[PDB]
């Protein structure tokens, strides 16, 4: 379902290359708002706009979405909560 | 042969192809003999039959497990625990694949077979190598066999995941990986462990800072290559300590200088 959220939210047809389970305090420094769980960060890439797309969900098996971060070349990233 | 993999020439037995009965064995998958002493060890343990049982139950279900078995325990099957130098830990294997059906997962961390896309963690690694004069042109591929051979022990803290699903087999492979790391830190000596991210850090608390050298930073994922990582210390008396960001550390330029400072044939990284 993860590949589909990103399309609904951005129109980008993309697949998950990799993912990392990070910790709440470790997210709060990047997003500004602290999650209520571990956060799987799922990573994908768009060579059309050359930018990193990355979905922040709860940990397995629930995969409850939490946020969406879209980061350009220079490395600043737009944050949309979900 | 098993590490120099070309996805265009990718002809490996599947799980069910290598385990026609649902019952899964692990003695088969482990080739290099210099591991049996550990391996036989973990057979004496209790989680081990339950582990093969969980794996079987996944094939009973019937999951599309990756990496394929003949590449599971790969780094082990090509690094004898004696001619090892660096231990780099991956959290969870590459879950994706290719339209060809080849999994990114080649049974080791951060490495993908040839003619296969280079994920951005590995690309940010290449960026680092270039930044610190260890490489001129970032390669077109992500086959890290030339690193494994020279003694870089790259493994995933969870050896299996189900295809396209991420972080599914943690509490299954924890008991295996912890014993592996304990075996390494206890029996062997002057290894170099590299902590990329919080999870590998958690796993490097199990290590003996009197014996081994530990590089520590944030993770090469684009979410973190530029972010510090605040966690704890290594020693018995912990303090709240902030470790630097992946792009601010000479990860590979510390390994070689330490190995030379212990009179050890260094690691040629470039490709």
The answer to whether B89 touches B123, Cβ cutoff 8 Å, is: no
Q: All domains of chain A, ordered by start, with CATH?
A: 1-82 (3.10.450.20)
Tell me how far apart the alpha carbons of residues B62 and B56 are, in angstroms, rounded to a whole number: 9
The answer to whether domain B7-262 has CATH 3.40.470.10 is yes
Tell me how far apart the alpha carbons of residues A63 and A59 are, in angstroms, rounded to a whole number: 6
Torsion, CA B258, CA B135, CA B220, CA B201, rounded to 10: -10
Closest to B225 measured CA to CA, from B155, B119, B120: B120
Cβ contact B223–A69 (<8 Å)? yes
The answer to whether B222 touches A43, Cβ cutoff 8 Å, is: yes
Cβ contact A43–B95 (<8 Å)? no
How close B193 gets to chain A, by Cα (Å)? 19
Q: Count CB neighbours of B43 within 10 A.
A: 12
* Structural domain spans, chain B: 7-262
CB crowding B216-244: b at 16 or more within 10 Å, else e: bbbbbbbbbbebebebeebeeeeeeeebe
Question: Which residues in chain B touch residue A51, judged by CB atoms under 8 angstroms apart?
Answer: none
Nearest chain A residue (CA) to B119 = A17
Cβ contact B120–A19 (<8 Å)? no
Cβ contact A60–B167 (<8 Å)? yes
A:1-20 residues touching chain B, CB 8 A cutoff: 2, 15-20
Approach to solving: X-ray
- Resolution to one decimal, Å: 3.1
Q: Count CB neighbours of A45 within 10 A.
A: 19
Cβ contact B221–A21 (<8 Å)? no
Phi-psi region of B123 (alpha: psi -120 to 50; beta: other; left: phi over 0): alpha
Nearest chain A residue (CA) to B121 = A18
Question: Which residues in chain A touch residue B227, judged by CB atoms under 8 angstroms apart?
Answer: 29-30
Catalytic sites of B, residue numbers: 92
How close A12 gets to chain B, by Cα (Å)? 17
Tell me how far apart the alpha carbons of residues B209 and B194 are, in angstroms, rounded to a whole number: 13
Q: Count CB neighbours of B208 within 10 A.
A: 14
Cα B208 to Cα B1, B67, B188: the distances in Å are: 35, 31, 11
The residues on B that touch A, with CB distances below 8 Å, are: 91-92, 94-96, 104, 117, 119-121, 164-168, 170, 197-199, 219, 221-224, 226-227, 229-230
Helix (H) or strand (E) holding A44: strand A39-46
HSE-up (13 A, CA, CB side) for residue B57: 8
Does A30 touch chain B if contact means CB atoms closer than 8 Å? Answer: yes
Nearest chain A residue (CA) to B218 = A26
């Amino acid at each position: 379902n993860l590949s589909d959220i990103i399309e609904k939210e951005t129109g980008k047809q993309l697949v998950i290359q990799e993912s990392i389970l990070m910790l709440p305090e470790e997210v709060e420094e990047v997003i500004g708002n602290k999650p209520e769980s571990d956060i799987l960060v799922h990573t994908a890439y768009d060579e059309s706009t050359d930018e990193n797309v990355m979905l922040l969900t709860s940990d397995a098996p629930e995969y409850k979405p939490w946020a969406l971060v879209i980061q350009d070349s220079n490395g600043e990233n737009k944050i949309k909560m979900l | 042969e098993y590490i120099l993999i070309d996805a265009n020439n990718y002809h490996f037995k599947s799980w069910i192809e290598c385990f026609p009965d649902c019952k899964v064995n692990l003695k088969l998958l482990l080739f290099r003999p210099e591991w049996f002493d550990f391996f036989k060890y973990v057979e004496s343990k209790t989680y081990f039959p339950q582990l093969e049982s969980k794996l079987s139950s996944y094939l009973e279900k019937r999951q599309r497990i990756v990496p394929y078995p003949e590449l599971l325990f790969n780094t082990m099957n090509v690094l004898p625990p004696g001619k090892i130098k660096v231990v780099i830990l991956g959290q969870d294997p590459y879950p994706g694949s290719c339209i060809s059906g080849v999994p990114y997962a080649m049974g080791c961390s951060f490495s993908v077979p040839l003619n296969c896309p280079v994920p951005k963690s590995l690309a940010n690694i290449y960026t680092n190598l270039i930044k610190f004069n260890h490489m001129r042109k970032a390669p077109k591929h992500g086959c890290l066999a030339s690193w494994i051979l020279q003694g870089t022990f790259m493994i995933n803290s969870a050896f299996t995941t189900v295809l396209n699903e991420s972080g599914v087999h943690a509490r299954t492979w924890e008991s295996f990986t912890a014993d592996l790391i304990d075996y390494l830190t206890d029996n062997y000596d002057d290894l170099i462990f590299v902590a990329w991210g919080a999870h590998a850090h958690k796993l490097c608390q199990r290590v003996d800072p009197k014996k081994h050298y530990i590089i520590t930073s944030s993770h090469p994922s684009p979410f973190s290559v530029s972010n510090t990582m605040t966690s704890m210390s290594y020693g018995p008396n912990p303090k709240k300590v902030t470790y630097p960001s992946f792009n601010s550390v000479d990860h590979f330029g510390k390994i070689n200088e330490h190995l030379k400072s212990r009179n050890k044939k260094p690691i040629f990284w470039d490709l």
